[PDB]
Each structure stands twice: as structure tokens, then as C-alpha cells.
Amino acid sequence: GFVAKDDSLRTFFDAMALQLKEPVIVSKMAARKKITGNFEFHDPNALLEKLSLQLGLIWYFDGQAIYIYDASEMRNAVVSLRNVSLNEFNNFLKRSGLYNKNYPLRGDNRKGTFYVSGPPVYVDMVVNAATMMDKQNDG
Amino acid sequence: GFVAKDDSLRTFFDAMALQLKEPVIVSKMAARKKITGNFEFHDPNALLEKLSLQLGLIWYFDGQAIYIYDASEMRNAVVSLRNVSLNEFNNFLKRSGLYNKNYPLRGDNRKGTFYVSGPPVYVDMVVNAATMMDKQNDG
Amino acid sequence: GFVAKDDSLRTFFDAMALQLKEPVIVSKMAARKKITGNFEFHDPNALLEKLSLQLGLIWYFDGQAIYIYDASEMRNAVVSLRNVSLNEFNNFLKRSGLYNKNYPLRGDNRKGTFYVSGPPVYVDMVVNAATMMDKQNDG
Amino acid sequence: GFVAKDDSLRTFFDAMALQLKEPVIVSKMAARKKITGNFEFHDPNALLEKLSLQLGLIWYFDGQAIYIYDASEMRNAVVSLRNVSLNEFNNFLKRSGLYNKNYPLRGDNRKGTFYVSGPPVYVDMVVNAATMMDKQNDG
């Protein structure tokens, strides 16, 4: 695996990227911080979720690459959904493979809106998809 | 065949291109990465699909040349199909020889749209063809 | 005939042109590539079709000169034919001596269009002729 | 006659012009090519048709001068003939002395058009005459 001794997170996630196929893109904000410890590379994704609790990093795999950001870079959005059922759009993203259970969407079956919270690429994916799906049924 | 010892992918795919008739065009992003290993050239296409799992490369043969890109260069598109049946257009591309089973199109027989995902030339081919076929029946 | 020993295709097709009456015009893209082997000049046209399988060259004789291009220079076009039967225009070109069986036209007797594929001069000849014939019956 | 030993076609046709009354005008494209062989000047016109098969030269005598061009300089045209019968205009040119049996016009008695093919002066003569004759009966 890898023993980090005050090494940058970028160095650390590059060492993790050596065990991965897809590219790993670490934000500048995360790259500036350092990490120390003996980290077994049996499951790089478990390290990513581990540092959500240890350092406060968030990430999203979009199917082609792993984006790693600081949790303070997390984006929030308010998205109305007039022509699509809130449960229907949730299933749509789950069916699409875009939805991420680590960053749940905050809907309300008594209202016509929902909230998006997550890393910048996760938020952009949900919000763009929501726009597409609502306007698609607009007629 | 060819024994790669930290050689660029461009070098590697040029060595594969020596066994091929058509030109092989490797993206700059792929050309910058390197490859190591003993690769038998009994089937260059099997090496191309192999590196979809080993390195994360995608490709498309358009009938005249082989385009090789990084999987992160993969393009996505949202294409409506109002005047052509989704199954009819799928068969059209399969009949045309444009459709590629390695990059399936994502249709839905309960909706009037479908999604395109693949390397930049595969996406452009499907999307341009979709535009042609829909507008063609627009009247 | 001619023994090519790493000679340019232009040199090679010039040696073939010595046995021909009409001029042979080789593209720059083809001229840049080289060729090796003992080539009997008993039938220059058989060498031209041979290199469609060996090197991946395409060509067209327009009645006055032989155009030689790389297969990657091949052009494609989408041509509607509203006022002329698809079989009638096929026969027209066959009757005209413009049609080339090495580069078949892709029609469909259930539709009002057809596709053109071939070297740049073959495509331009079919497409210009198609325009002429359709507009000719437009009234 | 004249024994050509790698002499320009212009030199060669100048030697033929010495046996002719009318001037002989050779294109620059033809003038640049050379010719070798023992050519009897018993019939300069037979040499002109001979080189249509040997070198690929085309020519036209317009009554006042002999124009000699390369066959690749051959022009083609599409000419409609609305107010004159296709056979009537053919006879007109045959009667006029403009028509040349070495470069037949391509008519169709089931259509209202015909095609012109020949050296630049032959094509211009037929096409200008066609314009004259059609517009002449336009009323």
C-alpha cells in the first residue's frame, strides 16, 4: 500500500491512482493539504470515504474519472421539478447511474421541489439532468 | 509482436498500426501516457479492447481509420427522436455499419429520446445521423 | 514492370503512369507514403485495386485521368432524390459511364434518398449529377 | 516527314504545321510534353487522331485554325434545348460545319436536354450555338 509521512494529498491520491484505471483529479484545495499514516490500498474507495470522516474530503466517480474536493467546496442547489415526479426523477438518476447514495437528494413528496447537495460535479450532474427532465415534459 | 518497455502509447499503437492497413490516430492525451508489457499482435482489436480494461482507453473504427482516445475524453449527448422510432434508428445505424456494440445507445421505448455515449467520433456520427433521420421525416 | 524498394507512391504510380496514356494524379497524402515489392505492370488497374487491400488507397478514373487518394480521404454525402427514381438515377450514371461498381451507391427503394461514398471526385460527380437530375424534373 | 527524338509537342506540331496552311495552336499543357518517333506527314490529321490514342491529345479544327489540347483539358457541359428539337440542332451543327463526329453530342430523344463534351473550343462552339438556337425560338 502506501505509508504517507506528511505527504501532500495529491501525492497520496496519486499513489492510490497507481492502483486505479481511471484518472483521479484532486482539487487544488485538497492538493495543498497533507496526510500521514499507513494506508492499505486494498480498496481506494474505502480510503476516499474514510477521509470524509478523517480529513473532511468529498468525492464523486462520474463513470470516467474520480473527482476529489474538499468538503468545504461542496455545492448546494435548489431545483424545482414541475413536470416530473420527484420519485420518478430519483429513479431516473438511479437508473442512469448518476445518483450517488453517499450524497442523497433532499426531496419532499408534499412539495414540487428538491435540494441538491454534493461535490461540484455531482451537483452539476443532478441539476443539468433535472433541467433536461423537467423541460422535456414541458408540453 | 511487440515488447513495450515504458514506451509511449503512440509508439505502441504505431507498432500495432504496422500490422494494420488503415491509419491509427491516437489522441494527444493517450499519446502522452506510456505502456509496458509483451503484446502479441495476433489481433490488434483485442489489444484495443484489452486496454479499455487495463488503461482505460476507448476507440472507434469508422470504416476508414481507428480513433483512439482516453476514456475521459468520452462524450455524452442527449438526442430527441420525434419522427423516427427509436428501434428503427437503432436498426438504421446497425444497417449503416455505424452502430458499435461496444458503445450501446441508451434508448427507452416509453419515451421519445435516447442518450449517446462514446468516443468523440462515435458520438458525432450517431448524433449527426439522428439529426438527419429525424429532420428527414419532419413533414 | 517495376521493383519498388522503399520508393514513394508517387514514384511508383509514375512508373505505372509510364504504361498508361492518361495522366495519373496522386494526392499529397498518398505521395508521402512509400511502397516496396516487385509489381508487374501487366494491368495497372489491378495494382490500384490491389493497394485498396494492401495499403488502403482508393482511386477513380473519370474517363480522362486517374485520381489516387488515401482511403481516409474518402468523402460521404447524403443526397435526396425527390423527382427521380432511385433506380432511374442509378441507371443514369451507369449509362453515363460515371457510376463505379467499386464504390456502390447506397440507395433504399422504400425511401426518397441515397448515400454517396467514395473518393472526392467520385462523390462530387455523383452528387452534382444528382442535383442536376432532380432539379431537372422539378416542375 | 519528321523524326522526333524527344522533341516537344510544340516542336512536333510546328513541323506538322509546316505542311499545313492554317495555324496550329498547341496548348501550354501539350507543349510541355515531348514526343519520339518517325512520323510521316502524309496526313497530319491522322497523326492528330493517332495521338488521341498514343498520348491522349484532343483537337478541333474550327475552319480557320487547329486547336490542340491535352485530353485532360476536355470540357463538359449540360445544355437544355427547350425550343429546338434535339435532332434539329444536331443537323443544324452538321449543316453549319461545326459538328465534329470525333466528339459526338450526347442527346436523348425522350428528354429535353443534351450533353456536350470535347475540347474547350468545340464545347464553346456547341454551347454558344445552342444558346443562340434556343433563345431564337423563344416566342
Numbering used by the authors:
A (entry chain D), B (entry chain C), C (entry chain B), D (entry chain A): 34 to 172
Tell me, in the authors' exact words, what the paper reports.
The bacterial injectisome, or type III secretion system (T3SS), is a specialized syringe-shaped protein-export system utilized by many pathogenic Gram-negative bacteria for the injection of virulence proteins (effectors) into host cells. The injectisome can be divided into three major regions: the inner- (IM) and outer-membrane (OM) spanning basal body with associated export apparatus and ATPase components, an extracellular needle, and a terminating pore inserted into the host cell membrane called the translocon. The major structural scaffold of the basal body is comprised largely of three proteins that arrange into a series of highly oligomerized, concentric rings: two intimately associated proteins localized to the IM - PrgK/EscJ/MxiJ and PrgH/EscD/MxiG, and a third protein belonging to the secretin family of OM proteins, InvG/EscC/MxiD (Salmonella enterica serovar Typhimurium SPI-1, Enteropathogenic Escherichia coli (EPEC) LEE and Shigella dysenteriae nomenclature, respectively). In summary, we report the crystal structures for the cytoplasmic and periplasmic domains of PrgH and InvG, two of the main basal body components of the prototypical Salmonella SPI-1 injectisome.
The stoichiometry of the T3SS OM secretin has been a matter of debate, with numbers between 12 and 14 proposed and recent studies favouring 12 for the secretins of other systems. Unexpectedly, the recent EM analysis of the SPI-1 basal body suggested a stoichiometry of 15. We therefore generated ring models with stoichiometries of 12, 14 and 15. Based on the docking results, the 12-mer model appears incompatible with the target region of the EM maps, having significantly lower interface energies and worse map correlation. Use of the higher resolution map, however, clearly favours the 15-mer assembly, with the 14-mer configuration having significantly worse correlation to the EM map and Rosetta energy. Using the high-resolution map, the modelling converged on two opposite modes – a “helix in” conformation and a “helix out” conformation” referring to the orientation of the helix in the N1 domain of InvG. The “helix in” mode shows excellent agreement with our previous biotinylation and cross-linking experiments, and better fit with the EM map. Finally, for InvG we observed a loop (residues 95–99) forming a series of side-chain contacts with the adjacent subunit. Mutation of Gln97 within the loop (which forms a hydrogen bond with the adjacent molecule) to leucine – but not alanine - abrogates secretion (top). Furthermore, we observed a positively charged interior collar of the InvG ring corresponding to the N0 domain, where residues are proposed to be in contact with the inner rod and socket.
